[PDB]
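Minutes, project huddle
Topic: does the predicted pose make sense with 2-acetamido-2-deoxy-beta-D-glucopyranose bound?
PN asked that the exact inputs be recorded in the minutes so nobody has to dig through chat later. Recorded below.
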Amino acid sequence: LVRDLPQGFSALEPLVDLPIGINITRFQTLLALHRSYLTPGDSSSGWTA
Amino acid sequence: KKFLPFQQFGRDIADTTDAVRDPQTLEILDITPCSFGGVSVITPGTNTSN
Ligand SMILES: *[C@@H]1O[C@H](CO)[C@@H](O)[C@H](O)[C@H]1NC(C)=O
Ligand SMILES: *[C@@H]1O[C@H](CO)[C@@H](O)[C@H](O)[C@H]1NC(C)=O
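Predicted holo structure (tokens), as shared on screen:
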């Protein structure tokens, strides 16, 4: 029942250290499309807008 | 003590390594110094006894 970031404290545990050794300046987030790009539905084809 | 998967050493006092994780066996063992203590001599006067 919290739309935004919740109030509280949670410490983030490390997951992995990748020796990528590359140069990073920009990043982008990948999403999943449940609907169809060929035929877009009027509504509800995606996930609750 | 429980070490997180990335944790290897332990320093609660920040100047002495109390605990560590053994490299071969993943058990965690804590290091206590070999101990010490002052030694006092209680003597009467050597003019009386040694
Ligand atoms: C990373 O690339 C930028 C150009 O986008 C460059 O200015 C920067 O010096 C590069 N950094 C490294 C560590 O290669
Ligand atoms: C490391 O080797 C030791 C002794 O053979 C054994 O406890 C265990 O199989 C290995 N543990 C790790 C860190 O893979």
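Observations noted during the meeting:
- Residues A 23, 25 surround 2-acetamido-2-deoxy-beta-D-glucopyranose (ligand 1) (CB under 6 Å).
- The interface with chain B takes residues 13-14 of chain A (CB under 8 Å).
No decisions taken; revisit at the next huddle.
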